[PDB]
Ligand SMILES: C[As](C)(=O)[O-]
Ligand SMILES: [Zn+2]
Ligand SMILES: [Zn+2]
């Protein structure tokens with residue numbers, strides 16, 4: 001139950017302050033290799049990211065989990081290069097996000113399970129870098145293909161002990177659908193983070209999942225298009241709720257007794273091609289702190305509301321370690 | 329000169345060409361992320377080299393691999409197979425039916441520059457340059473497909489490389505394609521309107537040929553299909569005909585083991601044209617020089633970069 005990173009296995013003691021939902025680059029499979037000019041250059045992306053991670057390291061971050069799948073253009077060589085140069089642990093992922101190509105979406109639950117296992121048990125591409133988390137996504141009512149992905153994720157998790165992290169669009173309360181399928185496969189809720197759960201203020205929804213032992217991904221705290229009302233693409237991607245509003249859900253879950261079920265992140269990136277052109281600039285305008293936003297802005301905000309330092313250390317260090325540590 | 333995955337070649341070196349083929353039909357990054365889907369990369373290479381050597385022994389000298397980025401083109405795979413089989417392979421840019429978000433969110437201007445990158449600079453970090461632009465079409469042409477066609481036209485106008493289309497979603501889609509290409513100022517002689525062998529509407533095909541378009545037939549009943557080649561010859565448009573198999577040696581973009589279905593239907597693979605179609609046409613009285621025009625002269629004129 002050491003944890004696999006892009007630099008190899010590390011012990012739980014070394015994981016430290018973890019951001020469990022981030023991205024070096026949000027893209028599409030092969031796109032970084034075929035069109036680096038889109039990002040200025042690969043070299044520019046590598047530097048921009050390295051600088052960003054280093055600033056997160058200065059603010060106390062020791063590990064990030066890059067939840068980019070194959071179809072979100074995960075380039076594990078970009079992750080390894082940036083991890084080493086920033087000296088920050090990066091856990092990579094398998095799974096399937098919202099843009100599977102035909103070679104993925106035509107696959108069977110059995111085939112998908114085998115693919116996830118390859119990426120966990122053997123390595124990603126020809127690199128030997130093994131995934132440490134499984135990635136899944138739904139929007140709205142689960143599609144037949146998304147249900148296959150969820151079942152394959154559960155089976156791969158049961159075989160390897162690595163956890164599952166989900167994209168929910170909304171809520172839209174997607175966690176209840178996901179949890180039902182995961183449990184039908186015998187997966188323990190303690191192996192699952194229901195992500196983008198900071199999109200909603202439905203505390204009944206959040207607390208009921210937490211009470212079942214799910215981890216709650218309050219993972220996009222700095223995402224907000226307040227002030228950018230004239231930019232429809234910004235509003236659609238980041239929403240109209242303030243970062244403080246998202247952050248207060250952390251306090252709300254603590255106050256209900258569920259501190260141990262909380263995972264906090266920025267869901268930041270250093271490049272993005274999967275959306276509108278130059279969207280990285282729009283996001284950067286909203287959060288110049290990048291991935292340092294959690295430790296620099298959110299932690300002090302929560303301490304200010306009277307949350308004890310020890311509880312914040314538990315959410316940022318202990319919870320991610322328990323989550324990431326492989327457990328059958 | 330024409331760019332191949334082994335560098336530039338002269339027109340005289342091109343020889344008998346199959347202008348619409350694939351080594352592998354897949355998705356971007358897939359071959360590398362899950363080569364075991366194909367058994368192994370090594371197995372895919374071995375099969376592709378055997379199949380290309382078979383085609384070469386039946387007279388083929390060049391294939392045009394019209395796999396785009398989104399059809400999982402791997403020019404390193406193409407280079408390896410090309411070298412081992414001693415068959416020239418022309419690589420493609422463009423957009424097929426499965427663009428990921430990073431492609432389908434792009435403007436006409438952005439796509440134009442990406443196609444130009446792949447033609448003028450090279451594919452990925454390989455220095456291998458695309459010698460053709462690829463556009464897949466459905467139905468009457470979707471808005472996004474129209475964007476791709478216009479970018480293809482603009483990249484062609486800047487470089488002289490031709491454009492080949494293929495239609496899956498069937499209508500008289502060639503006329504809509506032609507209208508878009510012509511609105512951009514593209515010469516029809518730079519365009520192969522593909523898989524025209526799907527229909528049996530000779531008047532439609534003849535009218536496109538008379539306008540200067542190349543007519544892309546393919547496919548692997550095949551005899552009825554082959555008789556359209558003769559019909560177009562007899563209309564006076566042998567110069568406008570291109571013939572290919574649209575074959576591949578691996579496929580992951582459809583159902584599992586579809587490659588087995590395909591191989592059971594057409595065990596000749598890419599040799600189907602020279603082993604079956606060419607003798608059939610010779611038997612129906614098409615002369616040698618005409619067959620050589622279709623298989624050698626037409627592809628060379630089509631592929632040789634020109635702005636006219
Ligand atoms: C790349 As996302 C907006 O699903 O974290
Ligand atoms: Zn997401
Ligand atoms: Zn994300």
Ligand SMILES: [Zn+2]
Nearest residue numbers: 464494495496
């Ligand atoms: Zn086609």
Ligand SMILES: [Zn+2]
Nearest residue numbers: 349350394574
């Ligand atoms: Zn094809």
